[PDB]
Amino acid sequence: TFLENIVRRSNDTNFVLGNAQIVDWPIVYSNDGFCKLSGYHRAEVMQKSSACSFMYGELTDKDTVEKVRQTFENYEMNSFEILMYKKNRTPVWFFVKIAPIRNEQDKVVLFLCTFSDITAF
Amino acid sequence: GAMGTEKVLQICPKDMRADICVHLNRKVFKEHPAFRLASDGCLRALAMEFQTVHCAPGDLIYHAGESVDSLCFVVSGSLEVIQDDEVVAILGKGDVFGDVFWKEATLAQSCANVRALTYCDLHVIKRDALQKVLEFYTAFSHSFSRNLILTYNLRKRIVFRKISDVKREEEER
C-alpha cells in the first residue's frame, strides 16, 4: 500500500522506510543506494532505528540527535546535517531529510528518510 | 500459505536435459554469490531440486505458525513480512528468507506471515534436499553457507512495542 507506493521510485536517492507505529521506528526497507552509502548490508540495516542511532559515534552532535528524535516524535518533516559513521568507521557528514508518510486515512504509517554525503554532488 | 501446497511447482521436468535445467535456474544461480564456485555436478543436482512459487497480490507465502522447510529466494516482485499485525520487513528481488538454522535444523515454525504485495515469483529449495547436496560437495558447503545471508529469519520473534500501547501504559501509571 503506502509502503509499496513509496519504494518507487529510487530517483537515484538513498533512503530507508521506518515503521511509524513502532517504538524506535524500525527500518523495514532500505534501498541499494542507502546500503552503498552507509556501507551496511540490507540484512543488517533491517529493524535498526530509522533515526540511525546504529551509525552514531563519538563525533555525532547529541543536540542534533535530539532534534532528529523529536522530528519522529512529532511526525514532522525536517532536514538536518549530522555526522555519522559508515560501517567502515569513517565519519561522514550526511544531509538527512525525514518525511512522515500518511495513508488514505491520513494516519502516519511510515517515515521516509533520505540520505546523502554532503561532499558528493 | 502457498508453501507446502500444489502452488509450489518443480522448476525442471524430471526428464529435462540437465544443462537446460541449470539454465532454468539462472536468476538465482548466476546472481546470488552463494552459488559462485559450484561444480557442474553440483549445479545440476541443485537445479533438479529447485521449485518455484508464483503468488498474486495478497497471497500468503507463509502464515505464522506454519512449518518452514525451505530456503526462499525472491526473483520477482515484493512481499511484506507481518508480525503481530505490523509490517516488520519489505522483501524484494534478490532477498532470501527462511530459517537462520536451515543447515542443521529440520524445521522451523514461522513467527510471521509473509504476504505478496505484488505478483511475486520465488525460487525455493527444501533444506533437506539442499543439505544432501552440501554434504557431498564439501568445499561448496563452506563457500555457500559463508555467502548465504538471510534478509529475514522466520524462526525468531521480533521484540517490539507499539507506540500507542506504551502511551496508554504510561497514562495508567
Coordinates of C-alpha atoms in Angstrom, one line a residue:
Chain A
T1 CA 0.0 0.0 0.0
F2 CA 1.7 3.1 1.3
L3 CA 4.9 1.1 1.7
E4 CA 4.9 -0.3 -1.9
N5 CA 3.9 3.1 -3.3
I6 CA 7.0 4.7 -1.8
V7 CA 9.6 2.2 -2.9
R8 CA 9.1 3.6 -6.4
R9 CA 11.0 5.5 -7.4
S10 CA 14.6 5.4 -6.3
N11 CA 15.1 8.7 -8.1
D12 CA 18.8 8.0 -7.6
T13 CA 18.2 8.7 -3.9
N14 CA 19.4 6.8 -0.8
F15 CA 16.6 6.0 1.5
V16 CA 15.1 3.8 4.2
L17 CA 11.5 3.3 5.3
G18 CA 10.8 3.2 9.1
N19 CA 7.6 1.9 10.6
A20 CA 5.9 5.0 12.2
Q21 CA 3.7 3.0 14.6
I22 CA 6.5 1.1 16.4
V23 CA 8.8 2.3 19.1
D24 CA 12.3 3.4 17.7
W25 CA 10.6 3.5 14.3
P26 CA 12.4 0.4 12.9
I27 CA 13.5 0.2 9.3
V28 CA 11.5 -2.2 7.2
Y29 CA 13.3 -1.4 4.0
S30 CA 16.5 0.2 2.7
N31 CA 17.4 0.6 -1.0
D32 CA 20.7 -0.2 -2.7
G33 CA 21.7 3.4 -2.6
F34 CA 21.5 3.6 1.2
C35 CA 23.4 0.4 1.6
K36 CA 26.1 1.6 -0.7
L37 CA 26.3 5.0 1.0
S38 CA 26.3 3.7 4.6
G39 CA 28.4 0.6 3.9
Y40 CA 25.9 -1.7 5.6
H41 CA 24.2 -4.8 4.1
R42 CA 20.5 -4.6 3.7
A43 CA 20.1 -7.6 6.1
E44 CA 21.9 -5.8 9.0
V45 CA 20.0 -2.5 8.4
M46 CA 16.7 -4.3 8.8
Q47 CA 14.9 -3.4 12.1
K48 CA 17.6 -0.8 13.1
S49 CA 16.0 2.5 14.1
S50 CA 15.4 4.8 11.1
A51 CA 16.8 7.6 13.2
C52 CA 20.0 5.7 12.6
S53 CA 21.3 5.5 16.1
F54 CA 23.3 2.5 14.9
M55 CA 25.5 4.9 12.9
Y56 CA 26.1 7.5 15.7
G57 CA 29.6 7.8 17.3
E58 CA 31.9 10.0 19.3
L59 CA 31.7 13.0 17.0
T60 CA 27.9 12.9 16.4
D61 CA 26.3 16.1 17.8
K62 CA 24.0 15.0 20.6
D63 CA 21.8 18.1 20.2
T64 CA 21.2 17.2 16.6
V65 CA 20.4 13.6 17.7
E66 CA 17.7 15.0 20.0
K67 CA 16.2 17.2 17.3
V68 CA 16.1 14.2 14.8
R69 CA 14.3 12.2 17.5
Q70 CA 11.9 15.0 18.2
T71 CA 11.0 15.1 14.4
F72 CA 9.9 11.5 14.6
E73 CA 8.0 12.0 17.9
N74 CA 6.1 14.9 16.4
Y75 CA 5.5 13.5 12.9
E76 CA 7.2 16.4 11.3
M77 CA 9.1 16.9 8.1
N78 CA 12.6 18.3 8.7
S79 CA 16.1 18.2 7.3
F80 CA 19.4 18.0 9.2
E81 CA 23.1 17.7 8.7
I82 CA 24.6 15.1 11.0
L83 CA 28.0 13.5 11.4
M84 CA 27.6 9.7 11.4
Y85 CA 29.8 6.7 10.9
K86 CA 29.9 4.4 7.9
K87 CA 30.2 0.7 8.6
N88 CA 34.0 1.1 7.8
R89 CA 34.1 3.6 10.7
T90 CA 34.8 6.7 8.6
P91 CA 32.9 9.7 9.9
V92 CA 30.8 11.4 7.2
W93 CA 28.6 14.5 7.2
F94 CA 25.2 13.4 6.0
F95 CA 22.3 15.6 4.8
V96 CA 19.3 13.8 6.1
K97 CA 15.6 14.5 5.3
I98 CA 12.9 12.9 7.3
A99 CA 9.3 12.8 5.9
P100 CA 6.3 11.3 7.6
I101 CA 4.1 9.5 5.1
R102 CA 0.4 9.2 5.6
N103 CA -2.1 6.6 4.2
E104 CA -5.5 7.3 2.7
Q105 CA -7.0 7.8 6.2
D106 CA -4.3 10.4 6.8
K107 CA -2.6 8.3 9.5
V108 CA 1.2 8.3 9.6
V109 CA 2.2 4.7 8.7
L110 CA 5.9 5.3 7.8
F111 CA 8.8 7.7 7.8
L112 CA 10.7 8.2 4.5
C113 CA 14.3 9.0 5.5
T114 CA 16.7 10.1 2.7
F115 CA 20.4 10.5 3.0
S116 CA 23.4 12.0 1.1
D117 CA 27.1 12.6 1.7
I118 CA 27.5 16.4 1.6
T119 CA 30.7 16.1 -0.4
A120 CA 29.0 14.1 -3.1
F121 CA 27.4 16.0 -6.0
Chain B
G1 CA 0.3 -20.2 3.0
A2 CA 1.3 -21.3 -0.5
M3 CA 4.3 -23.3 0.7
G4 CA 3.6 -27.0 1.1
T5 CA 0.8 -26.9 -1.4
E6 CA 0.3 -27.6 -5.1
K7 CA 1.1 -24.0 -5.8
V8 CA 4.8 -25.0 -5.4
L9 CA 6.0 -26.2 -8.9
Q10 CA 9.1 -28.0 -9.9
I11 CA 11.3 -25.8 -12.0
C12 CA 12.5 -28.7 -14.2
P13 CA 10.5 -31.6 -15.5
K14 CA 12.5 -34.7 -14.4
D15 CA 13.4 -35.8 -18.0
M16 CA 14.7 -32.4 -18.9
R17 CA 18.3 -32.3 -20.2
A18 CA 20.5 -31.3 -17.2
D19 CA 22.1 -28.3 -18.8
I20 CA 18.8 -26.8 -19.8
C21 CA 17.6 -27.3 -16.2
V22 CA 20.6 -25.3 -14.9
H23 CA 19.8 -22.6 -17.4
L24 CA 16.2 -22.5 -16.0
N25 CA 17.7 -21.7 -12.6
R26 CA 20.0 -18.8 -13.7
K27 CA 18.0 -16.0 -12.0
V28 CA 19.3 -17.4 -8.8
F29 CA 22.5 -19.4 -9.8
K30 CA 24.1 -16.6 -11.8
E31 CA 23.0 -13.7 -9.5
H32 CA 23.4 -15.0 -5.9
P33 CA 27.1 -15.1 -4.8
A34 CA 26.5 -18.2 -2.7
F35 CA 26.4 -20.3 -5.8
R36 CA 29.7 -19.0 -7.2
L37 CA 32.1 -21.9 -7.2
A38 CA 29.8 -24.8 -7.7
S39 CA 31.0 -27.7 -10.0
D40 CA 28.7 -28.6 -12.9
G41 CA 27.7 -31.7 -11.0
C42 CA 26.7 -29.5 -8.0
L43 CA 24.7 -27.0 -10.1
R44 CA 22.9 -29.9 -11.9
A45 CA 21.9 -31.5 -8.5
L46 CA 20.6 -28.2 -7.1
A47 CA 18.8 -27.3 -10.3
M48 CA 16.8 -30.5 -10.2
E49 CA 15.7 -29.9 -6.6
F50 CA 14.6 -26.2 -7.0
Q51 CA 10.9 -25.3 -7.1
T52 CA 9.1 -22.1 -7.9
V53 CA 6.1 -20.4 -6.3
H54 CA 4.0 -17.8 -8.1
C55 CA 1.8 -15.6 -5.9
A56 CA -0.9 -12.9 -6.6
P57 CA -1.1 -9.7 -4.5
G58 CA -2.5 -10.6 -1.1
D59 CA -1.5 -14.3 -1.3
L60 CA 0.3 -15.6 1.7
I61 CA 3.6 -17.5 1.2
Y62 CA 3.7 -18.5 4.9
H63 CA 1.3 -17.9 7.8
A64 CA 2.7 -17.5 11.3
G65 CA 2.7 -20.9 12.9
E66 CA 3.3 -22.8 9.7
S67 CA 6.4 -25.1 9.2
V68 CA 9.3 -23.5 7.4
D69 CA 11.2 -26.3 5.5
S70 CA 12.7 -24.3 2.6
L71 CA 15.1 -21.5 1.7
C72 CA 13.2 -18.9 -0.4
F73 CA 14.7 -16.6 -3.0
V74 CA 12.7 -13.7 -4.3
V75 CA 13.2 -13.4 -8.0
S76 CA 10.4 -11.0 -8.9
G77 CA 8.0 -8.8 -7.0
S78 CA 7.7 -7.5 -3.5
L79 CA 6.4 -9.0 -0.2
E80 CA 5.7 -7.8 3.3
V81 CA 6.6 -9.6 6.5
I82 CA 4.0 -9.1 9.1
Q83 CA 4.2 -9.9 12.8
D84 CA 1.6 -9.1 15.4
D85 CA -0.3 -7.2 12.7
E86 CA 2.6 -4.9 12.0
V87 CA 4.9 -4.6 8.9
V88 CA 8.4 -5.7 10.1
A89 CA 10.1 -6.0 6.7
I90 CA 9.6 -5.5 3.0
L91 CA 11.3 -8.1 0.7
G92 CA 12.2 -7.6 -2.9
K93 CA 14.2 -9.2 -5.8
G94 CA 17.4 -10.8 -4.5
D95 CA 16.2 -11.2 -0.9
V96 CA 16.5 -14.6 0.8
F97 CA 14.3 -15.7 3.7
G98 CA 13.7 -18.8 5.7
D99 CA 15.2 -20.4 8.9
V100 CA 18.6 -19.0 10.0
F101 CA 19.3 -22.5 11.2
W102 CA 18.5 -24.1 7.8
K103 CA 21.7 -26.0 7.7
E104 CA 21.3 -28.1 10.9
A105 CA 17.6 -27.8 11.8
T106 CA 14.9 -30.0 10.2
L107 CA 12.1 -27.5 10.8
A108 CA 11.3 -24.0 12.0
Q109 CA 7.8 -22.8 12.8
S110 CA 7.2 -19.3 11.2
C111 CA 6.9 -16.4 13.6
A112 CA 5.5 -14.1 10.9
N113 CA 3.1 -14.0 7.9
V114 CA 4.8 -13.4 4.6
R115 CA 2.4 -11.8 2.1
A116 CA 2.8 -10.8 -1.5
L117 CA 2.4 -7.1 -2.2
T118 CA 2.6 -7.6 -6.0
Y119 CA 2.6 -10.6 -8.3
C120 CA 5.6 -12.4 -6.9
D121 CA 7.9 -15.3 -8.1
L122 CA 10.0 -17.2 -5.6
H123 CA 12.6 -20.0 -6.3
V124 CA 12.6 -22.2 -3.2
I125 CA 14.6 -25.3 -2.2
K126 CA 13.8 -27.7 0.6
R127 CA 16.6 -27.6 3.2
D128 CA 16.7 -31.4 3.4
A129 CA 17.5 -31.6 -0.4
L130 CA 20.0 -28.8 -0.1
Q131 CA 21.7 -30.4 2.8
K132 CA 22.1 -33.7 0.9
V133 CA 24.0 -31.7 -1.8
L134 CA 26.2 -29.8 0.6
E135 CA 27.1 -32.9 2.5
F136 CA 28.6 -34.2 -0.8
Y137 CA 30.2 -31.0 -2.2
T138 CA 32.1 -30.3 1.0
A139 CA 34.1 -27.3 -0.3
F140 CA 31.0 -25.8 -1.8
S141 CA 29.2 -26.2 1.5
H142 CA 31.8 -23.8 3.1
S143 CA 31.5 -21.1 0.4
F144 CA 27.7 -21.5 0.1
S145 CA 27.0 -21.0 3.8
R146 CA 29.6 -18.2 4.1
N147 CA 27.7 -16.2 1.5
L148 CA 24.1 -17.1 2.2
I149 CA 22.8 -14.3 4.3
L150 CA 19.0 -14.2 5.1
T151 CA 17.3 -10.9 4.8
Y152 CA 14.6 -12.2 7.1
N153 CA 14.8 -15.1 9.6
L154 CA 11.3 -16.5 10.2
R155 CA 12.4 -18.5 13.2
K156 CA 12.7 -15.5 15.6
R157 CA 10.0 -13.3 17.0
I158 CA 10.9 -9.6 16.9
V159 CA 10.6 -8.0 20.3
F160 CA 8.9 -4.6 19.8
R161 CA 6.2 -2.4 21.2
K162 CA 3.6 -0.2 19.5
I163 CA 3.8 3.5 20.3
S164 CA 0.1 3.6 21.3
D165 CA 0.4 0.7 23.8
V166 CA 3.3 2.4 25.5
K167 CA 1.4 5.7 25.6
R168 CA -1.6 4.1 27.3
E169 CA 0.6 2.1 29.7
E170 CA 2.2 5.4 30.5
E171 CA -1.1 7.2 31.2
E172 CA -2.0 4.3 33.5
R173 CA 0.9 4.5 36.0

